[PDB]
Design a protein around this ligand. Structure first.
Ligand SMILES: *C(=O)[C@H](C[C@@H]1CCNC1=O)NC(=O)[C@H](CC(C)C)NC(=O)[C@@H](NC(=O)c1cc2ccccc2[nH]1)C(C)C
Length: 306
C-alpha cells in the first residue's frame, strides 16, 4: 500500500553522464556509444546568448574547442555536428556502460524521471510530468543543462528529455534527444513565456482509480454523466476536455475497480463542484494530475483492496 511520485532507478543513466566544456561555459552531456550529446548553447559566451546564430558560432570551433571529461578520464573529440538544438560530439572511446536505449519524443501529460547533474556528476532524481503547455516543473540551477529525462522499460532506457532553459515563472523547457524543443521555445536569452496551462484530466482520473485500488471510495457517488456534460464542468475548472480515447485508455483501471469511467467522471465533477471538504485522497488535499494510467498500473497492486 501507499502511493508516491516514484522515479525509475537512475543507475543505467548515471553511467552515461559526462562534462562538456567550451570556452568558459560548462554543462553536462550524454555519452552513448561513441557520441556525446549536449545542448548547443554550450558554445555561447554570456553575450552570445542574447541573440546567437549557432551556425555562425559553431563553424568558428574545431574538435579541440570541446573538452569532454568522463569522471577523471579525458575524452578526445574527433568530430562534431549540430542536430537541431543539440551538439553531437564524436569521441575516440565508446562508453562501456552504454545501456540498451532509445530516443523517444513524449506526449503532453506523460511522465518521466529526471537525473539532475552538475559538472557531469549526478546529484538528484525526481519524477516530472510534461505539462500541456510543454514545460516541466523541475528543480534546476545553473550548470544543470544537459541533464536528461528518461523512462526505463525492462532493460531499455528511453531518453525523452534534455534540459536547456528556465522560464520566468520558474518552470523548465528543453528538447528531445534529437534537439527539437517541447513547446514553442527557442534556446535564446530573449523574452519567452510559458503558455497558459491546464490540468491533465486523464491523470486526475487515473489517480482516483489509484485511490480506489488502495481501498478508498469516499469520493464516489450514485450519479453518472455524459462525456459532453463532464466537459462543460471541465471547461469551467480549466481541465482538459475528456475524449473517447481517454475513456478507452482508462479501460483496464475501470475493470480492476468495477467503476465505469463515466461514473468516475461523475465523481470528479462532484469533487470539482463541491471541493474535498477537508478530506484527503491518497494523502493529498488537492487533485493530483502528475500520474498517468501507466504510472498507476506500474505502482499499484493488481488486486483491489475491496
Ligand atoms: C543551463 O545550464 C541553464 C539552466 C537554467 C539556469 C537556471 N535554471 C535553469 O534551468 N540554462 C541557461 O542558462 C539558458 C541558456 C540558453 C537558453 C541560451 N538561459 C536561461 O535559462 C535564462 N533564460 C531565459 O530564457 C529567459 C530570461 C527571461 C526574462 C524575461 C522574459 C523571458 C525570459 N527568458 C534564465 C533566466 C537563467
Amino acid at each position: 500500500s501507499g502511493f508516491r511520485k516514484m522515479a525509475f532507478p537512475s543507475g543505467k543513466v548515471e553511467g552515461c553522464m559526462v562534462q562538456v566544456t567550451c570556452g568558459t561555459t560548462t554543462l553536462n552531456g550524454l555519452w552513448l556509444d561513441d557520441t556525446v550529446y549536449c545542448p548547443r548553447h554550450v558554445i555561447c559566451t554570456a553575450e552570445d546568448m542574447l541573440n546567437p546564430n549557432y551556425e555562425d558560432l559553431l563553424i568558428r570551433k574545431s574538435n579541440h574547442s570541446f573538452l569532454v571529461q568522463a569522471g577523471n578520464v579525458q575524452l578526445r573529440v574527433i568530430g562534431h555536428s549540430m542536430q537541431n538544438c543539440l551538439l553531437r560530439l564524436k569521441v575516440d572511446t565508446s562508453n562501456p556502460k552504454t545501456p540498451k536505449y532509445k530516443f523517444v519524443r513524449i506526449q503532453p501529460g506523460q511522465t518521466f524521471s529526471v537525473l539532475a547533474c552538475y559538472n557531469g556528476s549526478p546529484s538528484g532524481v525526481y519524477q516530472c510530468a510534461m505539462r500541456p503547455n510543454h514545460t516541466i516543473k523541475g528543480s534546476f540551477l545553473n550548470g544543470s543543462c544537459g541533464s536528461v529525462g528518461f523512462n526505463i522499460d525492462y532493460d531499455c532506457v528511453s531518453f525523452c528529455y534534455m534540459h536547456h532553459m528556465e522560464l520566468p515563472t520558474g518552470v523548465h523547457a528543453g528538447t528531445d534527444l534529437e534537439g527539437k524543443f517541447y513547446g514553442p521555445f527557442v534556446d535564446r536569452q530573449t523574452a519567452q513565456a510559458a503558455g497558459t496551462d491546464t490540468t491533465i484530466t486523464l491523470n486526475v482520473l487515473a489517480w482516483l482509480y489509484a485511490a480506489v485500488i488502495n481501498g478508498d471510495r469516499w469520493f464516489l457517488n450514485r450519479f453518472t454523466t455524459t462525456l459532453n456534460d463532464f466537459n462543460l464542468v471541465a471547461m469551467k475548472y480549466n481541465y482538459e476536455p475528456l475524449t473517447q480515447d481517454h475513456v478507452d485508455i482508462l479501460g483496464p483501471l475501470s475493470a480492476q475497480t468495477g467503476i465505469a469511467v463515466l461514473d468516475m467522471c461523475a465523481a470528479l465533477k462532484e469533487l470539482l463542484q463541491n471541493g474535498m471538504n477537508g478530506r484527503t485522497i491518497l494523502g493529498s488535499t488537492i487533485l493530483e494530475d502528475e500520474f498517468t494510467p501507466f504510472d498507476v498500473v506500474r505502482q499499484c497492486s493488481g488486486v483491489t483492496f475491496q
